[PDB]
């Protein structure tokens, strides 16, 4: 009864930046020996779990996220590094008991022109909390009269598209990052790694 990980990594369609899909899975047997022994990733920074010592501890739920960013944004998704995408699309707490994992997929999302559904959140009139998603198409008002239309007066659509073509630099290629989130709730551990 192995835990289903094919739907998270070996998927076909991935989500967007502003709406990161969750993949809560439990009541399984999660073999972690397929993550750290697979030469197909770029970052494997497990924060405070000692990835070698994961096949003995048991947890309760494993939350698997999945979204698409560019090369110069993979290092921004980590505790201790902020920038453009730090408080607009995704913000991680400063405990991160999971393992940030990413790989460069430049053969499925790098067509001529590219898919225009990858919309990163631009300047927002708010802040961001750990594990907080916000799917909103409201035009950003910088302080003037609200347009309440389609770029009426000083309005900007906050879902700026990405330019993904098979001719850009490595720092602008479509990446795919999966960030697991382990936890320990007040319940018997139903998922382990024997």
């Amino acid at each position, epitope marked *: 009864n192995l835990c289903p990980f094919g739907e998270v990594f070996n998927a076909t369609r991935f989500a967007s930046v502003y709406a990161w899909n969750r993949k809560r899975i439990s009541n399984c047997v999660a073999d972690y020996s397929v993550l750290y022994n*697979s*030469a197909s990733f770029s970052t494997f920074k497990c924060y405070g779990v000692s990835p070698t010592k994961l096949n003995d501890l048991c947890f309760t739920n494993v939350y698997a996220d999945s979204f698409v960013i560019r090369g110069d944004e993979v290092r921004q998704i980590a505790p201790g590094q902020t920038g453009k995408i730090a408080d607009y699309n995704y913000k991680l707490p400063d405990d991160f008991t999971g393992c940030v994992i990413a790989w460069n997929s430049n053969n499925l999302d790098s067509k001529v022109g590219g898919n225009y559904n990858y919309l990163y959140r631009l300047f927002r009139k708010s802040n961001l909390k750990p594990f907080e998603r916000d799917i909103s198409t409201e035009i950003y008002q910088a302080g003037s009269t609200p347009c309440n239309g389609v770029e009426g007066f000083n309005c900007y659509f906050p879902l700026q598209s990405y330019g993904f073509q098979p001719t850009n630099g490595v720092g602008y290629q479509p990446y795919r990052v999966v960030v697991l989130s382990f936890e320990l709730l007040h319940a018997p551990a139903t998922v382990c790694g024997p």
Partner: antibody
Amino acid sequence: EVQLVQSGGGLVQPGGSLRLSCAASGFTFSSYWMSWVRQAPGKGLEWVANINQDGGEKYYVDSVKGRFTISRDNAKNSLFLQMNSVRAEDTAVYFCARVWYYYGPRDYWGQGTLVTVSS
Amino acid sequence: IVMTQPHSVSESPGKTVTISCTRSSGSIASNYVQWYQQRPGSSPTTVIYEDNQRPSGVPDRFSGSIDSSSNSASLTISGLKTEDEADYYCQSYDGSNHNVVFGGGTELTVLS
């Protein structure tokens, strides 16, 4: 417990191939990645290659792409690095190291064999 | 892609010595950084891994760090003695071309 022995040290001329061996003893030879690292005399270490759990996926450094081949066999518990087209920059003391996990350190090392191409 | 280190260093016993491992290009927080200690002639051995945990048997006078500011990671060697005068290398898997990059090399010497 873990102990590695190397054999095949000698002296050849540019063009002559060699064979280096590394036999493991004390664990499972089908559960850890293997790698090779040479050390130029007085200089720093140099990565060479890394083999998969069976031998399917292999990656070599661009400096010796093609003229270097790493291989392993679970039925003998011995590592092999057979290469060809040896040139001047292949003068170093090769080692033998196993990998705990791919994105991890090299736990154990070997004694070392001097292989030079002196004229 | 390459890792840079100071050529050598010297200090009197009694305090801590530092060794620089500066990333040339790319992020330094990509994968784990592991240091090695090699006595002249002997076989290299792991002195630290993941920059936080320590291998079993290594003395408690070794606790490195990672500075995510300028892509660097220094080693903190406390309790400097004459029995630690050797070479120290850093190592960190970095790059999408599946290549391991070792360190430059640092010849740590003591006041003798």
